[PDB]
Design an enzyme around this catalytic site. Structure first.
Site, short mmCIF file in Angstrom:
data_model
loop_
_atom_site.label_atom_id
_atom_site.label_comp_id
_atom_site.label_asym_id
_atom_site.label_seq_id
_atom_site.Cartn_x
_atom_site.Cartn_y
_atom_site.Cartn_z
CD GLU A 49 -0.60 -6.10 5.52
OE1 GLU A 49 -1.23 -4.94 5.99
OE2 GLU A 49 -0.23 -6.50 4.09
CG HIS A 108 -3.41 -4.25 3.52
ND1 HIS A 108 -2.07 -3.07 3.99
CD2 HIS A 108 -3.56 -2.66 2.36
CE1 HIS A 108 -1.96 -1.78 4.29
NE2 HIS A 108 -3.26 -2.21 3.05
CB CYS A 162 -1.26 -0.20 0.59
SG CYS A 162 -1.89 1.15 1.63
#
Lengths: 287, 287, 287, 287, 287, 287
Positions: free
Chosen positions: A216, A214, A104
């Site tokens: 994660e 994202h 990001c």
């Protein structure tokens, strides 16, 4: 010939109203991301000397610039990310393989470091899961070379990617910029309904990967409702990190001594439970 | 009809020299094991009441029984594991799908819980990485159903599974026990060169699963040289957790309030940096 | 013609902390091993000249290279063995039958001495009693010709052989070595659950015999729980020594002075009681 | 149920010109004989209290009365032996299986202990190696039941048994004695050409075994020409001891602690190199 | 027709240390042996021609070959005895009755002369008194025909016969040699407990008699404890000599003149007292 | 209790025309006579103190008084024999059994000693062989108790006894003397044609034996035509000596040391070859 003990730098970033013991932070999910693919993790502090980053660079096996909300031009984060980018580019063309991950805000800075221009524009993507819309360069890519064919079809069709950015770079703003075009292979784009922006990319000539979204969050953050958690969103987080760690294993750097190692590792820090109201369930705070 | 926000309990166990704020512990690798497959984790306390445990049981979506060195008959761990086992059978029998995983000690505990007998013998498996000698019955198994064929071949031939146990049930003793033999399908064996023992099993009619080995270590523990860390050992630990959590997503239990849920989660606790000296990088200690 | 008063040298080995009268040692059970089969024993001192070893070699009927932990390349043990090994080849090639026996570290030196290379791997075999997995080549072998049938059955299935070695040669590495493949007949293998290694062998053309395990301990050592002592474990120690001493009965060397014979014999040395601490009940130390 | 850590007492005997630290002695070949069959040895001291012999008796698993040349009537050797004999008869008739072995002097002492008389005659048998002239009663027998058949044939026909005694009991004086004839099954005779004399015998109802010859010499004593040393002589010594020590593995006595065990063992003592002069290579001398 | 004044030659033998007046010796017990049965004696000298021997042979009525320890193949004794042996065969085949007696060394030489081979083994017989183990063939033998029955029974049971030989001919080797089997009737055998040997024989077709033992020592030699001296041993010496002299009575030779007879007779020599050192009370020494 | 190394005294006798080294003599045939029955012989000197005879008497086991031609009343021979006769009577009455033999001259001495008077007269007996005219009393007798019954018949019917005496006591003269007749049992008589004389006797109450003939000459003396030499005559001299020596075996005197024993024996002397001239083949002459 391989490093099966990889350690990866994760960049800390400036806290909004900064105080002692709260100058910078890392959301825990970035640390989990990498550990789960078999890396250990070192936080990279904000506001340090060029020599200090240079020592650590030579010790650790890759770096990740996480997402977040700080300036891309005047923050501690932006300055440090800049030194690693330059060091990383130098090491690779010396045949020292050293990979870099932008997520990001990290992806956005990579477009600024490579082109030298702030080319970002608003998109309605502050909070939404999305599929990926792959390009034709995907078949040839390094990043997705070991993803199961079924995960890839799922990626293209189901909302598996977390979006929580107010800025993106547009397909047209990307193609137009000579420097970006000739540096980074675009692997996926996305639309917010009016704007078509670059969503995943990798460098032609360097181990540098970036996602506007994202990877994660799917397995590790639970406090918002736009974070996908279906089995195939969980697999996506693994395979994304698995590829990145597999890149760090190509790096042979190692800490001077092992007591040095022990003292650098993320295990020296304890994060707080920030989940009751933040987007992050846990966050590490640094002086 | 799935639960895409699963919460798994992990059993703490009795600390050797029990000072207060340190009566029980959880190796953080068990927490990482589970989070990384898209569950959240709740630590299950050591010395509570049958009523308290059934209240936690009714809120959570599975349990894991970690490895360790504590008595199988007279510890806080052993007692609470028994309660959770009893409740899981009952739930499962009523259409309420609740999975149990046991690792090393948990697996050992499961042989005792289901046969009613202590059937363990010495084995020379205190710190070795082993492949899995699969049985014929892996072919139809639940646990390994989603593993890629490549990773199944890697598991049969590479030292991917970490062994750090003094006891096993030999295959001879497993087979002669009518209760084990009727209840559990053996998926793999191993040997120490003389004793042939059960390494992985799953319950025929219940979502109970168990490994003599430690799938969680490959990705998350780095302080002992018999922990495998190859790309395939890394996949192994994801695919093992990914199966278990997908099982918990079949459970529909939830917490009374999301206030109460918030106060139960492992995020409420800070693990201690134990890796300088111990087999665990990180351990959570509890009062 | 035979020699019914054979004398066999046993090689002393470097002491980890060398003092005077304590530069080297022989574990008493090696001396008991040969005596019990009807030989006398001469200890072979460590840091002597190539020239003194020929004079000793011309007077004795056999040598044995004990197990232990010392260096395979830089130790006085390793140099002296090298000399005997060469002395032994020359002699056998000229019709002077001279047998050599290697146990544990001595079996390992034998692989290095005949192949010219170090091909050893770590195995998890530091303290377990194992059966022998006989090759198809035992049927022809010299070493096992006079073992009773039942003893050979017992040895194939019962934990009768003491293993206390950190290293082995895998059967892979053995077989890939042309010199070893052509030189040694493999009589038994074993496993630690992953690594499969050579555990007994004899040279096709030379009276050279080696065990990765310790045949001497079953009858004579009592202070570790992995040493077997059943009646068939005891016969095993006797039939192993008996074969080797009947080999030495084929060499017709003698001491030319019956007065120097008298002074070279192990009976001039007294061993100390090391058993309260040591894996060895008794040990001879030498200046 | 069996004892696989057998410990056997060996009686010391009065030294002819007794001095401090040289009051009694054991020839080391008796120690070696028992160790090689898998037993440990306890030297039993000569002029000790009855409570002390009782404590030793209750600790060990069998006893051996060695050969030599001290008095059968008034030596410390004979008084101590008579005590052990009476302890063993009592224990065995109480169901506590306790073997006793008498060699040369010890065989003669057994005739006196059991008949209550001295029934001995001079024989020309100091120095000579003899076959055994087996009786019909060998066929049923315990002592020889595990000997290979071919060893029994060699025993019947080759000079494998060391004789070095001045006294024997004739077959005529033996059969004339009512007590001897009823108590002892005769297994072998021998002759010096004039006197035919009992050479091997076992009690009908007790585990009491006795040889006029010296089974321990073949493998371990080298300083006299009438000690047999052929392959089959060496097996004789093994199989004789093997039988006796397998007798002691039936007795379940143990020491009061492992510390008391340790203190009693022959490993606390160092033998003198005696072989240039005497018929014994090594001899333990005691205060 | 009968010769009641028999004259018998006794062969002298080489001294181990030849010196003038002392090149050959006769122990006097051999002279007294013959005289006491009513013969007179001529000492037969050692280094003489075939002719000198022929003339002597023609004059005497019998010859005896004494025991001792000189070579059987290469001494003056051996060559002289060979001559007489051939002369007596020739005379006896032509009706000239001429007896020969071989004691100890003489008995062994006879086995060589008649077999043409050296067939002797070590026996443990250098110092012992033995009964005779008579064969069936004593029953109608010549030697013992006139022994009283009471004496024959004593000889079978009591230690009446003196053995002092290192060498014997075993039963097996006698019976395996065709020539000896054809030529000699075996009257008695003896054993040292291992070797069974021939102890008394007589020629089937010739008056040739031989004892491995020494019948003359019993009445006449007092220097050793293994010489029997009971009354039936004294009777044994007489009857042995009585038979041999009654044989010589059948010979009709005489000396040419009575002056020559007088010069030949043992009476011309005076023995020396050698009883303090040697096994012989009195020994005649010759130049 | 017996003495099986008996030693017997033979009295020497005055030489006719005495010279130095020729004061006394003993015919060697008396020596051979006694040796041949298993005794050793001590010559007893003629002109010696009472204390030397007492010493010698207490050392030796019997005494023989030989034949010859010396004064019965005033010779050294006769004085020494008187001493011996009195000591022998005294020792016998005190339970010290001591036998005395008289031959010819000695027989005649005994008639004088025991009667106190000289009762001899001429008989034509100076050179004739005679049979014995046994009395009825021979049936009682001790002397002849062990003679084979065929020897007894021979002695009575064939000329077996040599007579070489000028004097005898007639039976009339014997029977007239009251002392002789109570003292001695007449065992045989003879006649010369005119005179009937006593030829063999033994005392009723003491071991005293006497022949008027010469039992010794048959086997040992060859120079006179009236010396019988038939096999029976030979046996006669053995059995007569055999009886006497068996008497001496009942006596338990010994010399005070071996040294003194050795110096007393006949082996210290060499006899002269007197055969060309005299009735004696060999005679010992003494200073």
């Amino acid at each position: 010939k391989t490093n099966e003990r990889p350690i990866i730098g994760v960049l800390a970033q400036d806290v909004f109203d900064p105080k002692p013991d709260r100058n910078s932070y890392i959301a825990a999910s970035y640390v989990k991301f990498l550990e789960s693919a078999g890396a250990r993790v070192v936080p990279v502090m904000i506001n340090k000397s060029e020599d200090e980053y240079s020592r650590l660079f030579k010790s650790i096996n890759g770096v990740l610039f996480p997402g977040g909300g700080v300036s891309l031009e005047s923050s501690g984060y932006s300055k440090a990310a800049g030194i690693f980018y330059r060091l990383a580019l130098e090491a690779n063309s010396n045949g020292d393989y050293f990979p870099v991950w932008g997520t990001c805000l990290g992806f956005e800075l990579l477009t600024l470091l490579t082109s030298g221009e702030l080319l970002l524009s608003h998109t309605n993507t502050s909070g939404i899961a999305l599929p990926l819309d792959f390009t034709e360069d995907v078949k040839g890519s390094r990043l997705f070379k070991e993803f199961p064919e079924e995960l890839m079809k799922s990626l293209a069709t189901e909302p598996l990617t977390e979006n929580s950015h107010q800025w993106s770079i547009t397909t047209e703003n990307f193609t137009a910029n000579k420097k970006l075009k000739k540096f980074y292979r675009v692997l996926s784009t996305n639309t917010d309904g009016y704007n078509k922006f670059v969503s995943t990319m990798e460098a032609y000539d360097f181990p540098i990967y970036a996602t506007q979204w994202h990877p994660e969050k799917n397995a590790f953050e639970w406090t918002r409702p736009y974070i996908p958690h279906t089995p195939s969103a969980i697999k996506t987080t693994f395979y994304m990190a698995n590829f990145f760690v597999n890149e760090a294993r190509k790096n042979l750097h190692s800490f001077a001594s092992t007591e040095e190692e022990e003292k650098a590792l993320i295990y020296n820090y304890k994060p707080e439970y920030t989940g009751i109201q933040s987007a992050f369930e846990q966050t590490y705070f640094f002086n």
